[model samples]
Target: EASSTAIRALVKKLIAAENPAKPLSDSKLTSLLSEQGIMVARRTVAKYRESLSIPPSNQRKQLVANSSSVDKLAAALEHHHHHH
Candidate 1:
């Protein structure tokens, strides 16, 4: 059985992998965890990903037009902290 510390560390690593700048898919994160001896299955990864509000990899890509608009909005928000 895994200790709480081990589980928490693994989860922290996984969450860091999910940040916007370097997002990882559930499968990829699971594979990475497995490499570290965590042994999570793909279905478990999917469930956890859902619980953490992460979408699947294919669905994560921004469509071109929407991507530009969203990027502009994000930049504006970062600079001004509000929208009217």
Candidate 2:
């Protein structure tokens, strides 16, 4: 009920904070949740992250690579627009 809702909210926040430069680990998430008075286990954090469709830390690093590629594409488009 309330606990589930709270957990979902926290997990979403955790996911939003994660990126290639500083991806959140399950143990770190567990500690953060405990600090926030949620007290979830590492396994629980992993489960929540998975259920939310958030990738694991290692895979999350790919996000930066994708972002860089997108930036390059946008820059190329802008260059083309300016020159032509």
Candidate 3:
């Protein structure tokens, strides 16, 4: 077994580097941890992700899209105000 502290730290790093266009899957997370010599299983990764309250990849993609849309709307509004 690994230290919960270390595991959680690695998980936080994963979350921070998570890509909106290509979010990491449990399998990919496992591979990454293995590369770091952490030796965690895919199920363990899933558990950590759940405990962290992070959404699945698909949901994350939707969130990215929503954020992009909001930015565009804000920019348009700013431009409109400047023109008026």
Candidate 4:
């Protein structure tokens, strides 16, 4: 049985590893967690990823592309100081 703290921490790390710029792959993310001594297997990682409603890395990339583009484009426009 997983403790509440463990579950919470796992979820937090999962979110932190998901980058808007480039989210980590399942293997890479698992490696990150392993580096932090979480030691979860890939299957477990998949389970938690699903529970968090985060798709696989490829899908996440597409989702981020669609979602962050608008905000990032606006920010770039604001910074550009009059469009070319």
Candidate 5:
């Protein structure tokens, strides 16, 4: 339903602004949303996050940590590809 579309926008916004070192957990998201009077359960928050192509916080944190230097890493990959 487009009804859920409203909450989806909010969830996506919170995720985009999350810290790389400590991504927001579904429970925290639920609490935050509830504070804003959104009233979604933790599972609902997680489902919305999954629908938005996001992983859970633990995995998100690890992946973010590993990719912290992604721009420089990509540069290295590009440099490595120049074979004589």
Candidate 6:
């Protein structure tokens, strides 16, 4: 099974309903696909992302958006924002 088409459809579907603010990275996407029984490489995911006219996660981030990946830097501050 070549899986070219399967890979394309599922890849698009995978990114479609994802977190818009911080789209998943290629590496993450690859692992997600594998979890669905579709194995692929990070660069292969990179190709499919561009093939679908979608930008990679790093390129897809909004100019002004909520912080992630570095949220731990504010981990100690989370206590202040939580419900009393």
For each candidate in turn, the TM-score is 0.33, 0.37, 0.39, 0.39, 0.38, 0.39
lDDT per residue as tens, model 3, 1-84: 567777778765655655535453444445556566564565666677678785545454443334344333332354332233
Model 2 clash pairs are none
lDDT, each prediction = 0.49, 0.54, 0.54, 0.55, 0.54, 0.56
Question: In model 1, how large is the Cα lDDT of residue 55?
Answer: 45
Which regions of candidate 2 fall more than 4 Å away from where they truly are?
1-6, 15-20, 33-38, 55-84
Tens digit per residue, CA lDDT, model 6, 5-57: 77767666555646544654544455556566564655665666567784456
Pairs that collide, model 4: none
Q: Mark the regions of model 5 whose C-alpha exceeds 4 Å error after superposition.
A: 1-6, 16-21, 35-38, 55-84
Q: Which prediction has the highest lDDT against the true structure?
A: 6
Per-residue lDDT tens digits for candidate 5, residues 1-84, read 888778867766555555534543444445456567564655665676567785445463444442334333332354333337
The deviation in Å at residue 72 for candidate 4 is: 28
C-alpha root-mean-square deviation, each candidate: 14.9, 15.9, 16.1, 14.1, 15.9, 10.7
Q: Residue 40's C-alpha lDDT in candidate 5?
A: 60
In model 5, pairs of residues that clash are none
lDDT of 1 at 80: 39
lDDT, model 6: 0.56
Better of 3 and 4 by lDDT: 4
Model 3 Cα shift for residue 71 (angstroms): 33
Candidate 2: count the clashes. Answer: 0
Clashing pairs in 3: none
For candidate 1, write residues 1-84 as lDDT tens digits: 657346444554754665534343444455566567554645654554545553466444554334334333332354433348
Better of 2 and 3 by TM-score: 3
Shift in Å, residue 39, candidate 4 = 3.8
